[PDB]
């Protein structure tokens, strides 16, 4: 009420070394993108407009061409967020009909998003198969009947399983779907655009391009995860299906705003131009082990002067991607600090309440600043923030 | 001259090994079984009265004292237990259960598959990774017969994950007048922290003192006995369960009966070092190194053999404590002429067979699961393979 | 509790002369077998493993080879007990369908096992035909219909009938089944492995090999009866059917334990090796009359010196099989004893309270020891046990 003297949203210095952070706003955007967003929003535009023909035009039009080239899909479409994509794909293709999905992929992502809950709401009929931990091909096949509208796979973005476990290979799903003439729908969630192994990160994570050339009929994902774009629900695949989807009156309630759209176009342009270093989420996961040290030591050089301050620099295995690559472990350089008068728990608590705030990881009352997620300009702001707190 | 079922030297350092026969028994238990099996017995007989008597009666007594439950029963195996609990209490009725507890343990056992064959009507709630208490309460209606919970014995989840506190389930059950059933699976009898192993693993006694109306579990896992389906809890329910005709098809044999009777005695006599599974999991890190270097001593003299001793963290419990990681001393070996993959293959086809881990062409003998008498047989076996 | 300090199951010397004794544990095992059981229990093993392939394997595998060869069936399977086999056979092949069976074969064996009761819990539907005493082929055929799934015969193991009686020849059943294309299931119950007349005991009792070569599609039986092994439900027959059965999820609830599997295998190996004398239940039923006498007078020799003891040796007709051959009447030599101070009712009572206990027959205040079921090592122990009770 009296907090209305200032906006509650503030920039925040991320030292958790966690690149995709559900809590801290997911993917940050490059300055290139943001200016472009800024430019389009400052006045009028050709949002819904064809300057060639002097008539109204589709907004999606702008984007879809990039997506089809980059992923290789026959057509594409973009809605508010992946939650909605999932929703839309189901309500559109499977209303009143059965959707076969593994008992192990019925996930909850975030607080309010639960596959079965949203699937129910869609109008779709959930046919669950296999077991929590193991699901075989026979499980999918067995549930096929006259009323089967769709074979579905969700990628477990936020958690993973270990031990006695089994999963169906996507090849097999497509094979299966082809054989019964049932469409395959893959919610990959991460919105990874192309293979990770190209940037020197070896992982199995599915990307649009590859899962499309594998013959999956529809593939969706979030824009603000491994795409490192703004928030969006990205769908790509068979033209016939996308079309039924674009037609669903619901797809108008899910229609993206001019800010995300513009931001998403530029992000795609960057990809087209192979400018990966210019989209933060990728730059951050691809950063050189030496550059992390270089940064860590650069920070330590700034903090020596501060009183009661114990400063070290460690080398550690961390899990950088939070809402995308949970199994992934990459080495990074954290800068560890300790204070005499204050427990690290109270230091951390004081740092969050600072302006601007700083969020970091703690281990055994040893305070860690993971360099992975820390920008150049933040260094200077960490020093000024620390001496103001400790030297008061 | 070879029978197909043979003693196998376990070097996998995996204590509860679903492949290699789960829990090995103590020579104390074994001889006892041997005695009861060698002639006739009072299996179903009352020597006081000179008439027929109950075969479980004694086992139940043990269990009732050790867990604290009103009554109890014992069937062929926990799959059976699960089948009988559901078939008896939930036929045509709905059983509420977490989408994250619908497990497959082994090749043949799937909660939803057996449950269906049960007659029970599966009402699945929550999500794979996160299930809340609301979820259970929500699926409660006129036809709800059971709030069920299955312990994830053979796999685990990491990351964003949620689960309902057992206490909350009991409260819930008590609130709506619905009985609660817990398939612990591992059949842990008492609290682990007693043997200096700190884990949250649920045990019969605690889960019973918590107010769970029924608890089940295998006899050949963390209880370290012979195969069995153990059920303990409210008397009125067990009564219903004993009365079901199917419980006759599930009736335990004289061997596991005797074996189980002895295993429980040891427990009553707090002799935990005399039940191998517990002894193996509680063994001293020095005793493992001691055992490791003792074996290396015997292997030096064999040709082509590179012998080292390492220190590694292993996950000892296979079908029971999947999260658990304990350190142990593996004796590592390699040969010049033969690849470790080929050497392991030749060890399996030996008499007696030897099963080991492979890590980067380094053959490993994890001492955790290896017995004293096994050392001398390994030597004799290795030299007969290599120098021949 | 106080009675907990010691186990309640104890070895017990059987002088009832009743070989298959429902109360005293049924079939005892030879030491060869027990040793083998002890060996496989003492440590780890190949239970569910393939040492050739270095991966998991079926446990049953080991056994099936033996059963298939011994009985001459295509395929076989082994569950917990014959009750379970019966339950499993029916729940697999006859759920919701009709099973035709003679009104004379609806049996209660044990206290807890009733065909019609378990068949009901089976899901199978009972179509009972004929009458108690007489049943003709006509009855069977006349009840066949669209929902007929199975023709079933249950062997009356624990009772028998005399007088005006009729029964369908197995051959005709098979012939009837082949006619309408209906499978025929025989619950032998006794699980006798080979024809008895080979050992000089002339009886009609059915065995596995003979009932299989007669074209019965499935035959089941107990392991701890006339097979002389540990407890088990043994099914043998047509592969196509065993297959369907093996795949029933319930068959995992009835999966046999490491101990009985071990014991079973050794038992069977003894059969392959044709060492019948090394399986107690066959040895005891085939014992020579002279041998029983020999044994009876060797006992009398030991007891003469005991005070107050009157000892004679008689020759009597007894009924050795309790739960398998109720008709069988065989001559045996009992050793009869009488005391002047103690009533035989009080003397038997004390003998059961001994360590080890001793259970015998009482007839008109005379105490009988039937040599059929008494081992050689038990004689000495009966001497020492008697003098301790009578002298003390
Ligand atoms: K929006
Ligand atoms: K058993
Ligand atoms: Pt008592
Ligand atoms: Pt006592």
- Cα–Cα distance for residue pair B307/A175, rounded to 1 Å: 49
Separation of CA C1 and ligand 4 centre (Å): 7
> How far is B363 from chain C, CA to nearest CA, in Å?
15
B385: its two tokens: 């393979």
Query: Cα separations (Å) of B374 from B127, B312, B344, B346, B353?
Result: 47, 21, 17, 17, 11
Radius of gyration of chain A (CA): 23
Please tell me whether residue A324 adopts helix, strand or coil conformation. coil
Query: Cα separations (Å) of A276 from A269, A272, C295?
Result: 11, 9, 96
For A49-114, where are the alpha helices, taking DSSP H only?
A: 60-71, 82-93
- Cα–Cα distance for residue pair A287/B282, rounded to 1 Å: 44
- Cα–Cα distance for residue pair C150/C134, rounded to 1 Å: 21
The kind and range of the H/E element at B105 are strand B104-105
Give the resolution value in Å: 3.2
- Cα–Cα distance for residue pair B247/B358, rounded to 1 Å: 44
Neighbouring CB atoms inside 10 A of B211's CB total 16
The residues facing A369 across adjacent strands are A335
Residues with their C more than 2.5 Å from the N of the next written residue in chain C, i.e. before a break, are none
End-to-end CA distance of chain C: 31
Residue A256 is classified by DSSP as P
State the SS3 of C141-154: HHHCCCCEEEEEEE
CB contact under 8 A, C12 and B42: yes
A185: its two tokens: 């729908």
B143: its two tokens: 């036809």
- Cα–Cα distance for residue pair C32/C35, rounded to 1 Å: 5
* Contact of C145 with C94, CB cutoff 8 Å: no
Residues with their C more than 2.5 Å from the N of the next written residue in chain B, i.e. before a break, are none
Q: Which experimental approach was used here?
A: X-ray
Residue A50 is classified by DSSP as B
Sign of CA dihedral B202, B208, B213, B218: positive
B193: its two tokens: 């922290």
Chains with 3 or more CB pairs under 8 A to chain A: B
Radius of gyration of chain C (CA): 23
The residues facing A316 across adjacent strands are A332
End-to-end CA distance of chain A: 30
Half-sphere exposure of B34 (CA within 13 A, CB side): 19
- CB neighbour list of residue B185: distance below 8 Å, 6 or more residues apart: B78, B105, B150, B151, B153, B216, B217, B218, B221, B320
Q: Which residues of C touch B52 (CB under 8 A)?
A: 23, 111
A236: its two tokens: 């790509």
CB contact under 8 A, B158 and A326: yes
Sign of CA dihedral A186, A192, A196, A198: positive
- Cα–Cα distance for residue pair B334/B340, rounded to 1 Å: 6
Sign of CA dihedral B267, B269, B272, B273: negative
- Cα–Cα distance for residue pair B213/B229, rounded to 1 Å: 16
Please tell me whether residue B388 adopts helix, strand or coil conformation. coil
* Contact of A286 with A200, CB cutoff 8 Å: yes
State the SS3 of chain C: CCCCCCCCCCEEEECCCCCECCCCCCCCCCHHHHHHHHHHHHCCECCCCECCCCECCCCCHHHHHHHHHHHCCCEEEEECCHHHHHHHHHHHHCCCCEEEEECCCCCEECCCEEHHHHHHHHCCEEEEECCCCCCCHHHHHHHCCCCEEEEEEECCCCCCCCCCCCCCCHHHHHHHHHHHCCCEEEEEECCCCCCHHHHCCCCCCCCHHHHHCCCCCEEEEECCCCCCCCCCEEEEECHHHHHHHHCCHHHHCCECCHHHHHHHHHHHHHHHCCCHHHCHHHHHHCCCHHHHHHHHHHHHHHHCCCCCEEEEEEEEEECCECCCCCCCCEEEEEEEEEECCCCHHHHHHHHHCCCCCEECEEECCEEEEEHHHCCCHHHHHHHHHHHHHHCC
Please tell me whether residue A61 adopts helix, strand or coil conformation. helix
For B227-368, where are the alpha helices, taking DSSP H only?
A: 235-243, 246-249, 254-268, 276-282, 285-299, 340-348
Query: Cα separations (Å) of B139 from A130, B125, B172, C330?
Result: 21, 7, 12, 65
End-to-end CA distance of chain B: 21
- Cα–Cα distance for residue pair A373/A45, rounded to 1 Å: 35
Q: Least CB-CB distance to C11: which of B39, B61, B256? A: B39
Separation of CA B41 and ligand 3 centre (Å): 22
Neighbouring CB atoms inside 10 A of A213's CB total 11
CB contact under 8 A, A106 and B112: no
B370: left (phi over 0), alpha (psi -120 to 50) or beta: beta
Q: Which residues of B touch C112 (CB under 8 A)?
A: 245, 247-248, 251
What length is written for chain C? 392
For chain A, where are the alpha helices, taking DSSP H only?
A: 31-41, 60-71, 82-93, 115-122, 137-142, 170-180, 208-212, 239-247, 258-272, 280-286, 289-303, 344-352, 376-390
Buried b (16+ CB within 10 A) or exposed e, C32-59: ebbebbbbbbbbbbbbbbebeeeeebeb
* Contact of C351 with C7, CB cutoff 8 Å: no
Half-sphere exposure of A312 (CA within 13 A, CB side): 9
* Contact of A279 with A244, CB cutoff 8 Å: no
Radius of gyration of chain B (CA): 23
- Cα–Cα distance for residue pair B59/C89, rounded to 1 Å: 30
The residues facing A363 across adjacent strands are A366
φ and ψ of A369, to 5 deg: -110, 100
Give residue for tokens 């691809």: A286
| Residue of chain A whose Cα is closest to the Cα of B123 | A128
A297: its two tokens: 């030591």
φ and ψ of B332, to 5 deg: -95, 140
> How far is B175 from chain C, CA to nearest CA, in Å?
32
Buried b (16+ CB within 10 A) or exposed e, A57-74: eebbebbbebbbebbebe
Q: A356 preceded by cis ω (within 30°)? A: yes
* Contact of B280 with B222, CB cutoff 8 Å: no
Query: Cα separations (Å) of C96 from C91, C119, C124?
Result: 9, 11, 5
Give residue for tokens 């189901």: A90
Sign of CA dihedral B360, B361, B362, B368: positive
Query: Cα separations (Å) of A79 from A210, C22, C59, C284, C388?
Result: 22, 73, 54, 83, 94
**A in contact with B (at least 3 C-beta pairs within 8 A):** yes
- Cα–Cα distance for residue pair A197/B224, rounded to 1 Å: 47
Query: Cα separations (Å) of A104 from A160, B157, C48, C295?
Result: 10, 11, 26, 68
- Cα–Cα distance for residue pair B11/C44, rounded to 1 Å: 10
Domains defined along chain C, listed by start? 2-23+287-392 (3.90.1150.180), 24-286 (3.40.640.10)
- CB neighbour list of residue B229: distance below 8 Å, 6 or more residues apart: B74, B75, B76, B77, B78, B79, B80, B81, B82, B84, B216, B217, B218, B219, B250
- Give, as residue ranges, everything with CB less than 5 Å from ion ligand 4: C 2, 5
The residues facing C309 across adjacent strands are C339
Q: Which residues of B touch C9 (CB under 8 A)?
A: 36, 41-43, 58, 254, 257-258, 261
Of C66, C77, C117, nearest to C255 by C-alpha is C77
Residue A30 is classified by DSSP as -
Q: What is the signed CA dihedral for B71, B168, B146, A106, rounded to 10 degrees?
A: -140
- CB neighbour list of residue A4: distance below 8 Å, 6 or more residues apart: none
* Contact of B262 with B268, CB cutoff 8 Å: no
Neighbouring CB atoms inside 10 A of B106's CB total 16
- Cα–Cα distance for residue pair B221/B277, rounded to 1 Å: 8
* Contact of C356 with C11, CB cutoff 8 Å: yes
- Cα–Cα distance for residue pair A278/A259, rounded to 1 Å: 19
């Amino acid at each position: 009420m009296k907090s209305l003297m200032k906006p509650n949203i503030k920039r925040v210095i991320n030292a958790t070394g966690v690149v995709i952070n559900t809590n801290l706003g997911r993917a940050p955007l490059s300055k290139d993108v943001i200016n472009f967003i800024s430019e389009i929003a400052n006045g009028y535009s050709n949002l819904e407009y064809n300057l060639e023909e002097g008539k109204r035009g589709s907004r999606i039009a702008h984007i879809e061409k990039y997506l089809n080239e980059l992923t290789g899909a026959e057509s594409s479409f973009v809605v508010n967020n992946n939650a909605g994509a999932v929703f839309l794909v189901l309500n559109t293709l499977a209303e009143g009909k059965e959707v076969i999905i593994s008992r192990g992929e019925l996930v909850e992502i975030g607080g309010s998003f639960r596959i079965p809950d949203i699937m129910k709401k869609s109008g779709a009929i959930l046919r669950e198969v296999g077991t929590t931990n193991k699901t075989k091909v026979s499980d999918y096949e067995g549930a096929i009947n006259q009323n089967t509208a769709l074979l579905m796979k969700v990628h477990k973005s936020n958690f993973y399983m270990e031990g006695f476990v089994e999963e169906v290979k996507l090849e097999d799903l497509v094979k299966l779907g082809h054989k019964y003439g049932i469409p395959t729908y893959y919610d990959a969630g991460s919105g990874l655009l192309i293979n990770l192994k190209e940037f020197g990160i070896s992982v199995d994570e599915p990307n649009f391009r590859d899962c499309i050339s594998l013959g999956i009929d529809l593939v969706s994902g979030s824009g603000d995860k491994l795409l490192g774009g703004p928030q969006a629900g990205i769908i790509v695949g068979k033209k016939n299906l996308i079309e039924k989807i674009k037609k669903n009156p619901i797809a108008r309630a899910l229609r993206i705003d001019k800010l995300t759209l513009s931001g998403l176009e530029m992000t795609l342009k960057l990809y087209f131009e192979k400018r990966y270093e210019d989209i933060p989420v990728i730059r951050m996961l691809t950063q050189d082990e030496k550059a992390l040290r270089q940064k860590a030591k650069r920070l330590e050089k700034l903090l020596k002067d501060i009183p009661g301050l114990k400063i070290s620099v460690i080398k550690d295995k961390a899990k950088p991607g939070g809402g995308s690559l949970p199994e992934l472990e990459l080495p990074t350089y954290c800068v560890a600090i300790r204070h005499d008068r204050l427990s690290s728990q109270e230091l951390s608590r004081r740092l969050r309440l600072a302006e601007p705030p700083i969020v970091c990881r703690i281990r055994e009352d040893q305070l860690l600043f993971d360099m992975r997620t820390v920008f150049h300009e933040d260094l200077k702001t960490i020093k000024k923030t620390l001496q103001e707190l400790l030297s008061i």
